[PDB]
Ligand binder design. Structure first.
Ligand SMILES: CCc1ccc(C(=O)NCc2cnn(C)c2)s1
Length: 284
C-alpha cells in the first residue's frame, strides 16, 4: 500500500498512537546481560536503554570491552550504522576508541550538549584549533581542523591520532543543531537535506566502517535518521518502490537495537521525511 495513502488514512483517522503501540508490541526482545553487569553501571546513560548482547560493539581491550553501542546491519539495503548514546564524562575515551577501531569516517550528532536546561551529552570534541583534547585512558588525540556553521547544521573536520602508532585519520562531524527541545520539526526539509550532506561526504559508503550516529539515548532521533536513509535507498533499488513498508523496515532495525523511534510523533515525522524525500528525489 503506497505509504502516502497509508499516511493520509492514519492522519484522517488520528490512529498514530495505535500504530506506534502495535510496533512496540511486535518488537524483538533479546538479552542485554553485558549492559546490566554491575561493573558497567557508570557506562550507561539510561537504565532502560541497553544494547542487545548479539549486536553490541566490542572495544578491543581485555580489561572491559563494554560500550552502549549497537551495529544495525541492513542486508537488502547494503548499509550498516552504529547507533550509540551521547558520551558520558567517563566514556568519551571509549567513544573515540570505537570510532578508531571500527574505521568510521563520519560521526552524526542529532542533539545539543544542553537541552531543556540539562546536559544531554559530554563536550566530547575540541572547540578551538589550538586547544586539542587528549584521552589518556585510550591513548588518542583529537584536534579541530575546521568548522563550517550553517543555519540548520554545522560540519567539522577533526584529526584523530592513535598516539600508540602515530597514525592519523580525518573524521567528519555532522551536527544537526535545530531539532526542537519539544516535539519534532514541522517540515522535514532541513532534516532530509542534512542526510543528503552526510551521504555526499562518503561517510555512509561501503569503503569506510559504519557511520557512528547518536542523540542523547541513541534510539529516538538516531532511529529517525537510519530509518529514513534505509527506506529511501530501498525505494531506489527495488522495481516497485511502493513495496517499501516503513513499519517492516523499523521492526527489522529493532532486531539490532531496542526502542528505535521513541514516540508516535517521531513515527509520523519518519513517514513524512520518506514521502517528501521520495516525491522530491523521484524525478529530481
Ligand atoms: C520539500 C522540500 C525538501 C527538502 C529536502 C528533501 C529531501 O528529501 N532530500 C534532500 C535532497 C537533496 N538532494 N537530494 C538527492 C536529496 S525534500
Amino acid at each position: 500500500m503506497e505509504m502516502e495513502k497509508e499516511f493520509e488514512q492514519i492522519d484522517k483517522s488520528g490512529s498514530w498512537a495505535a500504530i506506534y503501540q502495535d510496533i512496540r508490541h511486535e518488537a524483538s526482545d533479546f538479552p542485554s546481560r553485558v549492559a546490566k553487569l554491575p561493573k558497567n553501571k557508570n557506562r550507561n546513560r539510561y537504565r532502560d536503554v541497553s544494547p542487545f548482547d548479539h549486536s553490541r560493539i566490542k572495544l578491543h581491550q581485555e580489561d572491559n570491552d563494554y560500550i552502549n553501542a549497537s551495529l544495525i546491519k541492513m542486508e537488502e539495503a547494503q548499509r550498516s550504522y552504529i547507533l550509540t548514546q551521547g558520551p558520558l564524562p567517563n566514556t568519551v575515551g571509549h567513544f573515540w576508541e570505537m570510532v578508531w577501531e571500527q574505521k568510521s569516517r563520519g560521526v552524526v550528532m542529532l542533539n545539543r550538549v544542553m537541552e531543556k536546561g540539562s546536559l544531554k551529552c559530554a563536550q566530547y570534541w575540541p572547540q578551538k584549533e589550538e586547544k586539542e583534547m587528549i584521552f589518556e585512558d585510550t591513548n588518542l588525540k583529537l584536534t579541530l581542523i575546521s568548522e563550517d556553521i550553517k543555519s540548520y547544521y554545522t560540519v567539522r573536520q577533526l584529526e584523530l591520532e592513535n598516539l600508540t602508532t602515530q597514525e592519523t585519520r580525518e573524521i567528519l562531524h555532522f551536527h544537526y543543531t535545530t531539532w526542537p527541545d519539544f516535539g519534532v520539526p514541522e517540515s522535514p526539509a532541513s532534516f532530509l537535506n542534512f542526510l543528503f550532506k552526510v551521504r555526499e561526504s562518503g561517510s555512509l559508503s561501503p569503503e569506510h566502517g559504519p557511520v557512528v550516529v547518536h542523540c542523547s539515548a541513541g534510539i529516538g532521533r538516531s532511529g529517525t535518521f537510519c530509518l529514513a536513509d534505509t527506506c529511501l535507498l530501498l525505494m531506489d533499488k527495488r522495481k516497485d518502490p511502493s513495496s517499501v513498508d516503513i513499519k517492516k523496515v523499523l521492526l527489522e532495525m529493532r532486531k539490532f537495537r531496542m526502542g528505535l523511534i521513541q514516540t508516535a510523533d517521531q513515527l509520523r515525522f519518519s513517514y513524512l521525511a520518506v514521502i517528501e524525500g521520495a516525491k522530491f528525489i523521484m524525478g529530481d
